[PDB]
Design an enzyme around this catalytic site. Structure first.
Site, short mmCIF file in Angstrom:
data_model
loop_
_atom_site.label_atom_id
_atom_site.label_comp_id
_atom_site.label_asym_id
_atom_site.label_seq_id
_atom_site.Cartn_x
_atom_site.Cartn_y
_atom_site.Cartn_z
N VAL A 30 0.67 -1.22 -0.19
CA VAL A 30 0.14 0.13 -0.03
C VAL A 30 0.67 1.20 0.01
O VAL A 30 0.65 2.23 -0.57
CB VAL A 30 -0.93 -0.11 1.33
CG1 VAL A 30 -1.73 1.37 1.30
CG2 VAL A 30 -1.78 -1.31 0.96
N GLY A 31 1.82 1.31 0.87
CA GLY A 31 2.88 2.51 0.93
C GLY A 31 4.00 2.31 1.84
O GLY A 31 3.95 1.41 2.61
N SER A 32 4.92 2.93 1.44
CA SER A 32 6.24 3.29 2.24
C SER A 32 6.24 4.53 3.00
O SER A 32 5.43 5.52 2.37
CB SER A 32 7.32 3.32 1.30
OG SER A 32 7.56 1.90 0.82
N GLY A 33 6.91 4.60 4.16
CA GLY A 33 6.47 5.72 4.96
C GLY A 33 7.92 6.14 5.82
O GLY A 33 9.03 5.43 5.57
N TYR A 35 8.75 5.69 9.02
CA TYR A 35 9.02 5.10 10.22
C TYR A 35 8.45 3.63 9.97
O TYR A 35 8.67 2.72 10.92
CB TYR A 35 8.42 5.54 11.58
CG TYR A 35 8.77 7.13 11.87
CD1 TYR A 35 10.06 7.51 11.81
CD2 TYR A 35 7.51 7.76 11.37
CE1 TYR A 35 10.30 9.06 11.53
CE2 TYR A 35 7.90 9.07 11.47
CZ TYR A 35 9.11 9.73 11.67
OH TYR A 35 9.28 11.17 11.83
N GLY A 36 8.12 3.14 8.78
CA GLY A 36 7.65 1.86 8.73
C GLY A 36 6.94 1.78 7.43
O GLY A 36 7.15 2.62 6.50
N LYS A 53 0.89 -2.83 9.16
CA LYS A 53 2.02 -1.66 9.46
C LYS A 53 3.19 -2.47 9.92
O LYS A 53 3.23 -2.84 11.10
CB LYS A 53 1.54 -0.29 9.91
CG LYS A 53 2.94 0.57 9.95
CD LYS A 53 2.82 1.81 10.58
CE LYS A 53 4.06 2.69 10.93
NZ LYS A 53 3.68 4.13 11.67
N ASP A 149 -1.18 18.32 14.22
CA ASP A 149 -0.34 18.13 12.79
C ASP A 149 -1.63 17.48 12.22
O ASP A 149 -1.43 16.62 11.11
CB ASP A 149 0.54 17.17 12.93
CG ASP A 149 1.57 17.22 11.48
OD1 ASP A 149 1.42 18.49 10.77
OD2 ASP A 149 1.91 16.10 10.76
#
Ligand SMILES: Cn1nc(C(C)(C)C)cc1NC(=O)Nc1ccc(Sc2ccncc2)cc1
EC number: 2.7.11.24
Length: 336
Positions: A30-33, A35-36, A53, A149
């Protein structure tokens, strides 16, 4: 003495290895981030599509272990329909030496508000989404947790426009008292963000940009009007007090002139959320009562948290290893 707990299989997911229990199948990147990484899965028990995650090296640093520990605690404490919650937490590790990372299981959300933004939503859709936002904010604020945020990229929605609040230099959605630290801030900082988001939904155009803090302040005061003495006194920064008192005292507003497509109730709520005075700006509980949410308001759904979020180790200074024992012990005694 194994390599991983029985019931866990290995599988590459977007060019990297993953270790999952049997019950979760069909991993899809689904996605890269920061911190994980996050993949989608199917709980073969219920049949629901979940999101998993994998934390990337959470024990590389005291800051990172404290970070992941805090995220697990937060996800474990929040029990609200409009706040992302925990379904399961697991680690493929068998002892503390194999303990390298852990995984978080959450309800899967198709998209977020940043990806579908700009489509100039109708007043109905703005009402529904913003109402959900304010419910989640009332809940997390009632737990003593402030987001700090909030932004369209942190507001997940599904196909039915069901919303949940998430978390993981452009500061277009941050409250002025945070960008300038010209007075001490309370929970209503999040409320400012909601305003900035709602206005965008009305216009399809970001409200305040600015290439630095001063330029963004000028853009903001174009909307809020230069505040009067009643506000200027509350500032603790004297140089900012002088700068504001030196500006051409340009009055407010006129929010029905700033957003001509805005209904009077929408313009009014926007007036009360985009308030410079952090003591006059609406709380989430107060903003829920605004007539803009009359077609959707259900006070029974406007729940608070039973207990405040109690991170006693929020300030503690432990080694990476001690944090590791904390997180590990938190994983075992977690229970669905
Ligand atoms: C730190 N923190 N604070 C909160 C509040 C809102 C309760 C204050 C939530 C989190 N953690 C988090 O959002 N983690 C997370 C976010 C997005 C994904 S990706 C995804 C999630 C669900 N469906 C699809 C994709 C994964 C984990």
């Amino acid at each position: 003495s194994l390599i991983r707990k029985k019931g866990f299989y290995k599988q590459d997911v977007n060019k990297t290895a993953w270790e999952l229990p049997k019950t979760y199948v069909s991993p899809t990147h689904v996605g890269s981030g920061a911190y994980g990484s996050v993949c989608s899965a199917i709980d073969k028990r219920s049949g629901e599509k979940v999101a998993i995650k994998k934390l990337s090296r959470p024990f590389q640093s005291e800051i990172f272990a404290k970070r992941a520990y805090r995220e697990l605690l937060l996800l474990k404490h929040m029990q609200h329909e409009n706040v992302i919650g925990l379904l399961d937490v697991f680690t493929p590790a068998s002892s503390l030496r194999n303990f390298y990372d852990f995984y978080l299981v959450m309800p899967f959300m198709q998209t977020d508000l940043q990806k579908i933004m700009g489509m100039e939503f109708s007043e109905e859709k703005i009402q529904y989404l913003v109402y959900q936002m304010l419910k989640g904010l009332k809940y997390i604020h009632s737990a003593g947790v402030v987001h700090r945020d909030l932004k369209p990229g942190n507001l997940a929605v599904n196909e039915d426009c069901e919303l949940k609040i998430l978390d993981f230099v452009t500061r277009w959605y941050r409250a002025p008292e945070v960008i300038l630290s010209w007075m001490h801030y309370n929970q209503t900082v999040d409320i400012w963000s909601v305003g900035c988001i709602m206005a965008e939904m009305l216009t399809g155009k970001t409200l305040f940009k600015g290439k630095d803090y001063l330029d963004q302040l000028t853009q903001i005061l174009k909307v809020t009007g230069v505040p009067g003495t009643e506000f200027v006194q509350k500032l603790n920064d004297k140089a900012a007090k002088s700068y504001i008192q030196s500006l051409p005292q340009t009055p407010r507003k006129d929010f029905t002139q700033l957003f001509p497509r805005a209904s009077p109730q929408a313009a009014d709520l926007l007036e009360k959320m985009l308030e410079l005075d952090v003591d006059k700006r609406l709380t989430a509980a107060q903003a829920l009562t605004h007539p803009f949410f009359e077609p959707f308001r259900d006070p029974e759904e406007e729940t608070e948290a039973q207990q405040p979020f109690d991170d006693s180790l929020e300030h503690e200074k432990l080694t990476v290893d001690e944090w590791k024992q904390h997180i590990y012990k938190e994983i075992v005694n977690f229970s669905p």
